[PDB]
Design a protein around this ligand. Structure first.
Ligand SMILES: CC(=O)N[C@@H]1[C@@H](O)[C@H](O[C@@H]2O[C@H](CO)[C@H](O)[C@H](O)[C@H]2O[C@@H]2O[C@@H](C)[C@@H](O)[C@@H](O)[C@@H]2O)[C@@H](CO)O[C@H]1O
Length: 240
């Protein structure tokens, strides 16, 4: 066990300990590594490579701007990965490709403007995908294939519409967060999202410290009228 952390079995608790780097003594038997709420600013190239039994990795609440290429590649058992509340400005190509068992991925509250091509394509088992509070300007391509999703968080980005049909195979969704985006309701491309929200009112959620059902929380930029109240005649294909 690392000097400044506490280990109970295969649980290594390094949370809330003002760590400026990943600590040296992490046991090879670790299954849950909790590094939440520290001041870690980078990961060294092969830091997790020996931690082959990891199931859950909490990197929430740190100061990461980037990740080393291949940093998660040896974590073949990983099911849970949180990277929320860092300041990631990009992800390396293929960063999640080896994480075949992942069911939970949290990228909330970073500085992402775009994701690598096909970044989620290998994550066939994903049930929860959270990427609120970034600077995304379009829906990451490939999300439409993630048919086992129950939770999808896209709130508080810079999204203006959703590509036609993108949510149609996501038939297991129970929680979809869409608020806080500048939806472009003047453009006729908004109509798919309008129709989809209106057809799925019970799963669209806002966040009052917790999930709250509210289909009107997806709102039009400028007017702050509900997206589902948009009429086709109020839109034009020449305003896109
Ligand atoms: C690893 C983990 O559980 N992290 C939690 C975050 O995912 C939570 O963020 C909130 O997540 C929901 C979707 O599940 C939604 O995207 C919320 O908008 C999001 O909250 C945002 O981020 C928070 C830190 C606040 O800034 C909030 O005002 C934002 O709207 C947070 C919720 O506190 O808890 C983490 O533990």
């Amino acid at each position: 066990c690392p000097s400044q952390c506490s280990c109970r079995g295969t649980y290594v608790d390094c949370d809330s300990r003002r760590l400026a780097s990943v600590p040296a003594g992490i046991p090879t038997n670790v299954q849950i590594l909790n590094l939440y709420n520290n001041q870690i600013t980078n990961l060294e190239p092969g830091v997790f490579d020996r931690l082959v039994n990891l199931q859950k990795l909490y990197l929430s609440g740190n100061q990461l701007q980037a990740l080393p290429v291949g940093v998660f590649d040896k974590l073949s058992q990983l099911t849970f990965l949180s990277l929320d509340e860092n300041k990631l400005t990009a992800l390396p190509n293929g960063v999640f490709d080896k994480l075949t068992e992942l069911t939970y991925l949290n990228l909330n509250t970073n500085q992402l403007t775009a994701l690598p091509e096909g970044v989620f394509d290998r994550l066939v088992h994903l049930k929860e995908l959270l990427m609120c509070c970034n600077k995304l300007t379009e829906l990451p391509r490939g999300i439409e294939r993630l048919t086992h999703l129950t939770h999808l968080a896209l709130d508080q980005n810079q999204l203006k519409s959703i590509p036609h049909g993108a949510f149609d195979r996501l038939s297991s969704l129970t929680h979809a967060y869409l608020f806080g985006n500048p939806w472009d309701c003047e453009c006729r491309d908004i109509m798919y999202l309008r129709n989809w929200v209106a057809d799925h009112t019970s799963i669209v959620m806002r966040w009052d410290g917790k999930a709250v059902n509210d289909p009107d929380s997806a709102k039009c930029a400028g007017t702050n009228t509900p997206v589902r109240a948009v009429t086709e005649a109020s839109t034009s294909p020449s305003k896109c």
